[PDB]
Amino acid sequence: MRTVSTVAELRAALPREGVGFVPTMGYLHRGHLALVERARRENPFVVASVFVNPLQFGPGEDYHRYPRDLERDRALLQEAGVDLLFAPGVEEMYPEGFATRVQVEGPLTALWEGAVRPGHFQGVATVVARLFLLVQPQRAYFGEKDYQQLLVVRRMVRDLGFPVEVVGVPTVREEDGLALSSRNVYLSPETRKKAPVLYRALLAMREVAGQGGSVAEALRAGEEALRAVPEFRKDYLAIVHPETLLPLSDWVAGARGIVAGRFPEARLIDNLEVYP
Amino acid sequence: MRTVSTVAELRAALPREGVGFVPTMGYLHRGHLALVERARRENPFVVASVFVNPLQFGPGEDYHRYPRDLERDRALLQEAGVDLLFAPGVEEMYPEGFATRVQVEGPLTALWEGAVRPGHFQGVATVVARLFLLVQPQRAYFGEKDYQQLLVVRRMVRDLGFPVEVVGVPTVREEDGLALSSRNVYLSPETRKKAPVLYRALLAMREVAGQGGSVAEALRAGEEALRAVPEFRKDYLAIVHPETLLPLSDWVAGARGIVAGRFPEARLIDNLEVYP
Ligand SMILES: [Cl-]
Ligand SMILES: [Cl-]
Ligand SMILES: [Cl-]
């Protein structure tokens, strides 16, 4: 595998066709592997990027302490069979003079994560748009854990006309159900034991739905599950339309249960299709 | 020449390489063909687009009044040699649910035309971004008359990494000096006689520069010229940096004289390299 740190080397090592792309912020885990694994079975050439994007972090968030270990990410991607790793510094990604932004407007970015993290999705859209133009991939892979982000990217691609197939990959979880995330490293041993509550709440709602319960009944079950862990301060818990993310009054195929909140040392999010 | 009005047709008729692109809003004049000509010679396949972009029209502007004559444009590009014409409707370019925007921020879009027409450059960046993504050109041609717009597109291209060479083409002028513009049709025979004041002002400034005068002396000369035609309500007149459009404290190669204002029936803009 070849690792490049500049746009010049990137464009020079890139094939005109057959490129599968996996954008990441580094400190890779099994979940990222699931993405690489999928890109490889569908594309003759796989490119992965590791770049902690400052544009998608808020002032009081974790940009400075975000986990970083390029060597670990390299060996790892190397073993996974990645053809090309793009690991640029902030200056190569955003040179002096950089002044452009891309953003998806409307309820899609205003709801849920958008209300908690103002400016976050504009940062995601901007960096993904740049990465797409630099990589010119045929297919790009994203995890479903960041469901809203997946929808935002799809909207941007649809609107602007990026000839990119945006593929969502199901979330990889620990045995206790905790969705894998680079930020899980922030969890203390004690908090790590309580962290499975998000997925537990989501499963509780899916259970109710499967048993013929109402959306309202499913929501109550989810809320109850979360209350077993007071240390988890919920930002939101809802069952929404799979495409618009608007709260549902009645079930629809693809109904998505979403939840987010924080422990003292980390904020976690998770989601699951709760119907059918 | 093949004419397409949908995205599907467009993608199906486009070759993968050697595409020269000329974006316009219709009602073509000598100047546009100066662009189509340039492209026809440097690229094996030429595509031109005709679309009045509602996004770059703001409050109290001439959207519905903008001149439209598709058939005249067609036959025009036909004889010019263009291989493909993309003339989509508003709904094809911006289908229901469209919510993405692209914008270049900072002084480049806040000064001059940006101050006069707020929201204008976001509309331009957005439509150009989409067109570039839909056409996937190797080169795109723009007229220098809209110099600021030219720099904005170059900035967006450089920032986001579009693999497109943006070509600026010198303005085509009338015998009296009036830069050609599809909006000149708005001028009455009377005000048309006064219109040459813009170029006159620019020339006055270039003359001072050539004589060794200071940047301030050049502006004075330009102010004098406009002062003679009070009918022209000046928006701005300045000598700026060729790349940043910031007012100049002193001369630099490529110094650009820019002017804009409005007669009762229309708004006019023009620019010219005043130094060296
Ligand atoms: Cl983030
Ligand atoms: Cl992650
Ligand atoms: Cl306009």
XYZ file of C-alpha atoms and ligand atoms in Angstrom:
555
model
C 0.000 0.000 0.000
C 1.159 3.506 -0.867
C 0.679 6.333 1.630
C 0.601 9.878 0.257
C 0.329 13.133 2.190
C -0.140 15.675 -0.600
C -2.752 16.311 -3.261
C -0.093 16.189 -5.974
C 0.991 12.650 -5.066
C -2.666 11.630 -4.661
C -3.819 12.670 -8.125
C -0.697 11.117 -9.656
C -1.283 7.697 -8.059
C -5.007 7.557 -8.797
C -6.663 5.357 -11.492
C -9.241 6.966 -13.783
C -11.875 4.322 -12.994
C -12.723 1.563 -10.508
C -12.077 3.503 -7.302
C -13.726 2.569 -4.001
C -13.315 5.274 -1.338
C -13.403 5.086 2.466
C -13.124 8.510 4.195
C -12.145 8.379 7.882
C -10.772 10.534 10.683
C -8.289 7.882 11.791
C -7.633 5.758 14.873
C -9.276 2.895 13.005
C -11.188 -0.027 14.474
C -13.056 -3.098 13.146
C -15.890 -0.900 11.916
C -13.610 0.849 9.461
C -12.409 -2.581 8.332
C -15.991 -3.524 7.535
C -16.015 -0.482 5.239
C -12.702 -1.356 3.594
C -13.799 -4.983 3.234
C -16.928 -3.868 1.367
C -15.067 -1.396 -0.877
C -12.672 -4.144 -1.861
C -15.280 -6.705 -2.934
C -16.851 -4.082 -5.182
C -13.953 -2.078 -6.608
C -10.585 -2.982 -8.151
C -8.846 -0.060 -6.411
C -9.448 1.086 -2.840
C -8.517 4.451 -1.374
C -8.811 5.420 2.262
C -8.256 8.823 3.802
C -7.306 9.638 7.378
C -7.935 13.275 8.263
C -9.276 14.794 11.454
C -11.375 17.549 9.875
C -11.311 20.710 12.026
C -14.238 22.210 10.101
C -16.685 19.689 11.569
C -15.741 20.319 15.229
C -17.192 23.038 17.460
C -15.062 25.318 19.692
C -15.819 23.420 22.892
C -15.627 19.951 21.364
C -12.695 17.508 21.077
C -10.640 18.518 18.029
C -7.447 18.805 20.086
C -7.743 15.528 21.991
C -9.209 13.482 19.150
C -7.301 10.145 19.045
C -4.422 10.100 16.583
C -2.064 7.246 15.608
C -1.163 7.223 11.909
C 1.199 4.268 12.127
C -1.458 2.050 13.664
C -3.863 3.174 10.948
C -1.312 2.389 8.211
C -0.312 -1.146 9.226
C -3.971 -1.844 9.678
C -5.108 -0.524 6.307
C -2.072 -2.247 4.798
C -3.193 -5.635 6.109
C -6.746 -4.914 4.934
C -5.382 -4.672 1.401
C -5.957 -0.966 0.770
C -4.230 0.286 -2.375
C -3.775 3.912 -1.374
C -3.880 5.835 1.911
C -4.282 9.621 1.809
C -3.077 11.189 5.074
C -2.777 14.978 4.602
C -2.000 17.625 7.177
C -4.489 20.447 7.732
C -2.437 22.805 5.563
C -2.464 20.532 2.503
C -6.217 20.039 2.911
C -6.976 23.693 3.662
C -4.139 25.820 2.219
C -3.760 29.521 2.976
C -6.588 31.306 1.185
C -9.117 28.475 1.462
C -12.512 30.190 1.673
C -15.118 27.853 0.204
C -17.870 25.976 2.005
C -20.518 23.481 0.978
C -23.652 22.959 3.046
C -26.960 21.140 2.914
C -29.717 23.409 4.197
C -33.134 22.648 5.587
C -34.508 20.270 8.279
C -32.118 17.498 7.300
C -29.173 19.345 8.836
C -31.161 21.440 11.301
C -32.655 18.533 13.237
C -31.046 16.214 15.795
C -27.231 16.354 15.495
C -27.567 19.691 13.725
C -29.154 21.331 16.754
C -26.579 19.899 19.134
C -23.584 20.536 16.873
C -24.106 23.803 14.949
C -21.707 24.050 12.028
C -20.924 20.314 12.149
C -22.642 19.273 8.896
C -21.286 22.218 6.945
C -17.860 20.949 7.966
C -18.700 17.414 6.875
C -20.208 18.467 3.537
C -17.262 20.717 2.757
C -14.560 18.129 3.447
C -16.465 15.295 1.781
C -17.021 17.432 -1.319
C -13.290 18.172 -1.506
C -12.311 14.543 -0.899
C -14.732 13.427 -3.624
C -13.253 15.857 -6.153
C -9.699 14.873 -5.250
C -10.392 11.131 -5.286
C -12.995 10.989 -8.060
C -14.345 7.703 -6.614
C -17.047 5.572 -8.211
C -18.328 4.471 -4.800
C -17.763 5.931 -1.325
C -18.429 4.027 1.907
C -19.901 5.398 5.144
C -21.037 3.704 8.338
C -24.718 3.782 9.273
C -23.888 4.728 12.865
C -23.765 8.329 11.620
C -27.117 7.893 9.885
C -27.945 11.599 9.579
C -24.466 12.258 8.146
C -25.065 9.490 5.603
C -28.295 11.163 4.527
C -26.621 14.590 4.355
C -23.887 13.261 2.085
C -26.473 11.554 -0.128
C -28.443 14.785 -0.378
C -25.335 16.767 -1.339
C -24.350 14.177 -3.952
C -27.878 14.103 -5.383
C -28.155 17.897 -5.487
C -24.736 18.802 -6.876
C -24.605 15.775 -9.151
C -21.499 13.994 -7.885
C -21.185 10.813 -9.969
C -20.632 8.909 -6.721
C -22.499 5.921 -5.316
C -22.822 6.554 -1.579
C -22.897 3.212 0.225
C -24.046 2.878 3.810
C -22.609 -0.047 5.755
C -24.367 -1.559 8.790
C -22.854 -0.699 12.157
C -20.293 -3.032 13.732
C -20.805 -3.514 17.478
C -19.042 -4.925 20.533
C -20.568 -8.111 21.974
C -22.568 -6.061 24.468
C -24.037 -4.013 21.611
C -21.950 -0.840 21.924
C -21.356 0.588 18.446
C -17.641 0.845 17.675
C -16.327 4.402 17.433
C -12.850 5.896 17.659
C -14.151 8.106 20.467
C -15.049 5.092 22.631
C -11.408 5.307 23.790
C -12.545 8.284 25.926
C -14.746 6.041 28.087
C -13.522 5.117 31.545
C -13.744 1.427 32.480
C -16.866 2.161 34.534
C -18.576 4.246 31.834
C -17.755 1.623 29.189
C -19.955 -0.794 31.144
C -22.924 1.590 31.041
C -22.429 2.703 27.411
C -24.408 -0.250 26.000
C -27.571 1.512 27.165
C -27.997 3.424 23.871
C -28.231 0.218 21.837
C -30.313 -1.345 24.601
C -32.849 1.473 24.314
C -32.930 1.087 20.529
C -33.508 -2.665 20.827
C -36.296 -2.082 23.337
C -38.091 0.092 20.798
C -37.541 -2.433 18.033
C -38.969 -5.129 20.315
C -42.175 -3.153 20.931
C -42.528 -2.482 17.201
C -42.150 -6.174 16.441
C -44.790 -7.041 19.031
C -47.326 -4.769 17.347
C -46.863 -1.870 19.740
C -47.468 1.752 18.770
C -44.769 4.318 17.995
C -45.678 5.993 21.284
C -45.396 2.673 23.115
C -42.027 2.019 21.484
C -40.797 5.450 22.589
C -41.822 4.804 26.189
C -39.907 1.519 26.194
C -36.831 3.307 24.861
C -37.055 6.089 27.445
C -37.421 3.518 30.222
C -34.280 1.694 29.121
C -32.243 4.914 29.194
C -33.472 5.760 32.683
C -31.556 2.767 34.062
C -28.425 4.888 33.503
C -28.737 8.412 34.978
C -25.126 9.176 34.077
C -26.255 9.235 30.437
C -27.728 12.651 29.654
C -29.948 12.259 26.599
C -29.909 14.909 23.857
C -32.743 13.100 22.064
C -34.546 9.800 21.529
C -36.927 9.388 18.615
C -38.399 7.197 15.893
C -38.212 9.017 12.579
C -38.821 8.770 8.863
C -35.793 7.082 7.209
C -35.364 9.828 4.598
C -36.579 13.062 6.231
C -35.757 12.228 9.861
C -39.071 13.743 10.974
C -40.713 12.124 14.043
C -43.392 9.590 13.101
C -46.959 9.407 14.401
C -47.402 6.040 12.696
C -45.092 3.239 11.520
C -43.476 3.233 8.084
C -41.075 0.757 6.520
C -37.571 1.838 7.480
C -38.677 3.732 10.591
C -35.429 4.714 12.280
C -34.859 4.816 16.016
C -32.179 7.370 16.843
C -30.611 8.367 20.121
C -27.785 10.582 21.371
C -26.557 11.891 24.684
C -23.471 12.240 26.780
C -21.516 10.828 29.658
C -19.135 13.195 31.431
C -16.168 12.201 29.262
C -17.859 11.446 25.955
C -20.888 11.990 23.769
C -22.296 8.942 21.988
C -24.910 8.435 19.282
C -26.525 5.343 17.780
C -29.472 4.373 15.615
C -31.331 1.309 14.391
C -34.124 0.450 11.950
C -37.019 -0.377 14.282
C -39.667 -1.297 11.688
C -40.608 -3.673 10.125
C -25.284 19.929 -32.643
C -27.346 17.876 -30.229
C -29.651 19.715 -27.832
C -30.523 18.145 -24.500
C -32.730 19.556 -21.745
C -32.365 16.870 -19.095
C -29.515 15.535 -16.956
C -29.918 11.981 -18.242
C -29.562 12.947 -21.909
C -26.608 15.160 -21.008
C -24.656 12.391 -19.285
C -25.436 10.000 -22.139
C -24.150 12.390 -24.814
C -20.934 13.435 -23.076
C -17.551 11.944 -23.974
C -15.282 11.213 -21.024
C -12.372 13.375 -22.126
C -11.381 16.482 -24.046
C -14.469 18.486 -23.136
C -14.428 22.275 -23.399
C -17.308 23.930 -21.525
C -18.936 27.317 -22.083
C -21.630 28.225 -19.491
C -24.050 31.035 -20.348
C -27.530 32.234 -19.489
C -28.841 32.633 -23.041
C -29.469 35.482 -25.492
C -25.946 35.071 -26.868
C -23.894 37.848 -28.455
C -20.532 38.233 -30.203
C -18.743 37.837 -26.879
C -20.108 34.374 -26.124
C -18.965 33.066 -29.476
C -15.561 34.473 -28.596
C -15.743 31.907 -25.797
C -17.220 29.092 -27.897
C -14.554 29.818 -30.504
C -11.739 29.598 -27.970
C -13.143 26.278 -26.716
C -13.854 24.843 -30.170
C -10.159 25.225 -31.000
C -8.562 23.896 -27.803
C -10.894 20.972 -27.123
C -12.042 18.046 -29.330
C -15.587 18.222 -27.903
C -17.430 21.427 -26.986
C -20.454 21.768 -24.733
C -22.310 24.999 -24.044
C -25.131 25.504 -21.586
C -27.973 27.998 -21.650
C -29.775 28.522 -18.373
C -31.072 31.567 -16.540
C -30.031 30.649 -13.016
C -32.667 31.973 -10.563
C -30.260 31.461 -7.659
C -27.984 34.306 -8.734
C -30.887 36.762 -9.022
C -31.755 38.591 -5.826
C -34.350 41.045 -4.437
C -35.456 43.669 -6.928
C -33.382 42.279 -9.782
C -34.224 41.444 -13.424
C -35.025 37.720 -13.296
C -38.295 37.549 -15.248
C -37.148 40.498 -17.352
C -33.926 38.765 -18.418
C -33.822 38.343 -22.238
C -34.671 34.852 -23.512
C -34.517 33.407 -27.048
C -33.600 29.725 -27.045
C -34.026 29.143 -30.775
C -31.712 32.036 -31.639
C -29.081 30.642 -29.266
C -29.407 27.150 -30.750
C -28.859 28.085 -34.383
C -26.089 30.325 -33.095
C -24.128 27.628 -31.328
C -24.987 25.342 -34.240
C -23.053 27.432 -36.746
C -20.340 27.996 -34.136
C -19.590 24.273 -34.092
C -20.672 23.333 -30.568
C -21.230 19.570 -30.298
C -23.733 19.726 -27.462
C -26.086 22.270 -25.942
C -27.523 21.836 -22.469
C -30.614 23.986 -21.980
C -32.428 22.608 -18.924
C -35.489 24.040 -17.231
C -35.440 25.286 -13.647
C -37.014 22.052 -12.387
C -34.397 19.889 -14.102
C -31.513 21.870 -12.599
C -33.160 22.207 -9.188
C -35.598 19.318 -8.684
C -37.910 19.320 -5.684
C -35.954 18.708 -2.512
C -32.852 20.527 -3.770
C -31.176 21.983 -0.680
C -27.433 22.220 -1.239
C -25.461 25.432 -1.660
C -21.834 26.218 -2.449
C -20.291 29.528 -1.463
C -16.935 31.281 -1.584
C -16.605 33.470 1.512
C -14.313 36.288 2.567
C -13.452 39.618 0.868
C -13.605 38.101 -2.632
C -17.387 37.852 -2.449
C -18.102 40.521 0.168
C -16.677 43.457 -1.780
C -17.831 45.186 -4.940
C -20.535 43.127 -6.684
C -20.992 41.096 -3.526
C -21.973 44.159 -1.525
C -24.292 45.387 -4.262
C -25.892 42.005 -4.963
C -25.981 39.960 -1.732
C -26.544 36.266 -2.363
C -25.474 36.589 -5.998
C -22.159 34.760 -5.759
C -23.599 31.876 -3.762
C -26.068 31.351 -6.588
C -23.250 31.442 -9.129
C -20.915 29.128 -7.216
C -23.781 26.695 -6.715
C -24.893 26.506 -10.367
C -21.320 26.413 -11.664
C -20.409 23.677 -9.196
C -23.330 21.546 -10.407
C -22.655 22.252 -14.083
C -18.982 21.327 -13.604
C -20.033 18.089 -11.914
C -22.592 17.279 -14.601
C -20.348 18.145 -17.550
C -17.004 17.013 -16.088
C -15.089 19.379 -18.423
C -11.333 19.589 -18.858
C -11.655 23.333 -19.480
C -14.405 25.875 -18.802
C -14.524 29.328 -20.381
C -15.639 32.590 -18.775
C -15.548 36.170 -20.007
C -13.366 38.687 -18.190
C -16.155 41.283 -18.195
C -17.436 39.569 -15.055
C -13.932 39.551 -13.624
C -15.015 39.100 -9.997
C -17.191 36.134 -10.931
C -14.142 34.755 -12.743
C -11.973 34.947 -9.616
C -14.760 33.459 -7.514
C -14.992 30.427 -9.802
C -11.231 30.030 -9.790
C -11.207 30.216 -5.989
C -13.968 27.598 -5.675
C -12.148 25.346 -8.151
C -8.827 25.721 -6.319
C -10.376 25.261 -2.869
C -12.582 22.245 -3.598
C -10.202 20.615 -6.074
C -12.308 20.511 -9.244
C -10.104 19.036 -11.995
C -11.014 21.929 -14.290
C -8.827 24.547 -15.977
C -10.770 27.823 -15.776
C -10.041 30.039 -18.779
C -10.708 33.769 -18.702
C -11.300 35.413 -22.083
C -10.843 39.158 -22.767
C -13.991 41.250 -23.147
C -15.397 42.010 -26.596
C -16.337 45.686 -27.006
C -18.447 47.881 -29.280
C -16.787 50.506 -31.469
C -17.567 53.088 -28.795
C -16.045 50.838 -26.135
C -19.157 49.499 -24.412
C -18.446 45.952 -23.271
C -20.952 43.521 -24.775
C -23.583 42.129 -22.416
C -26.930 40.405 -22.932
C -28.341 43.132 -20.677
C -27.392 46.020 -22.972
C -30.701 45.297 -24.705
C -32.263 47.139 -21.753
C -30.636 50.432 -22.727
C -32.657 53.058 -24.566
C -31.093 54.810 -27.580
C -30.446 57.751 -25.250
C -28.818 56.061 -22.265
C -26.959 53.879 -24.764
C -25.087 57.007 -25.839
C -23.951 57.573 -22.250
C -23.061 53.925 -21.552
C -19.502 54.308 -22.918
C -18.731 56.288 -19.763
C -17.679 53.122 -17.908
C -14.952 52.178 -20.381
C -14.006 55.854 -20.651
C -13.462 56.009 -16.893
C -11.364 52.820 -16.964
C -9.262 54.139 -19.860
C -8.689 57.405 -18.013
C -7.244 55.470 -15.089
C -5.025 53.282 -17.273
C -3.763 56.452 -18.962
C -2.717 58.033 -15.677
C -0.980 54.820 -14.624
C 0.904 54.716 -17.901
C 2.038 58.303 -17.367
C 3.553 57.388 -14.019
C 0.726 58.733 -11.906
C -0.145 57.366 -8.476
C -3.013 55.000 -7.754
C -4.886 57.914 -6.160
C -4.329 60.117 -9.217
C -5.638 57.307 -11.400
C -8.836 57.064 -9.351
C -9.332 60.835 -9.522
C -9.109 60.702 -13.299
C -11.711 57.951 -13.246
C -13.981 59.833 -10.854
C -13.828 62.856 -13.158
C -14.995 60.795 -16.148
C -18.021 59.413 -14.298
C -18.796 62.852 -12.834
C -19.567 64.044 -16.364
C -22.458 61.581 -16.675
C -24.574 62.017 -13.502
C -27.221 59.801 -15.114
C -24.873 56.956 -14.231
C -25.396 56.289 -10.527
C -22.063 54.805 -9.458
C -21.977 51.680 -7.295
C -18.169 51.696 -7.020
C -14.941 52.635 -8.789
C -11.600 51.247 -7.669
C -8.164 49.970 -8.602
C -7.674 46.558 -7.009
C -5.345 43.592 -6.694
C -5.770 41.234 -9.696
C -6.370 38.229 -7.441
C -7.792 39.444 -4.127
C -9.774 42.438 -5.413
C -8.579 44.407 -2.394
C -8.031 48.127 -2.950
C -4.392 48.820 -3.801
C -2.149 51.006 -1.678
C 0.285 50.967 -4.592
C 0.715 49.525 -8.112
C 1.242 45.819 -8.738
C 1.467 44.113 -12.135
C -2.078 43.331 -13.228
C -3.721 46.082 -11.160
C -7.402 45.968 -12.108
C -9.653 48.966 -12.562
C -13.280 48.055 -11.859
C -16.501 50.068 -12.166
C -20.210 49.463 -11.728
C -23.343 51.567 -11.551
C -26.847 51.868 -12.896
C -28.906 53.857 -15.354
C -32.675 53.976 -14.759
C -33.235 50.976 -17.043
C -30.172 48.844 -16.328
C -27.062 48.208 -14.265
C -23.655 48.088 -15.947
C -20.229 46.833 -14.881
C -16.811 46.815 -16.526
C -13.165 46.302 -15.632
C -9.748 46.620 -17.211
C -6.104 45.968 -16.395
C -4.728 49.436 -15.684
C -1.145 48.487 -14.848
C 1.385 48.017 -16.360
Cl -17.019 14.789 14.380
Cl -15.623 6.337 14.079
Cl -26.805 37.874 -12.966
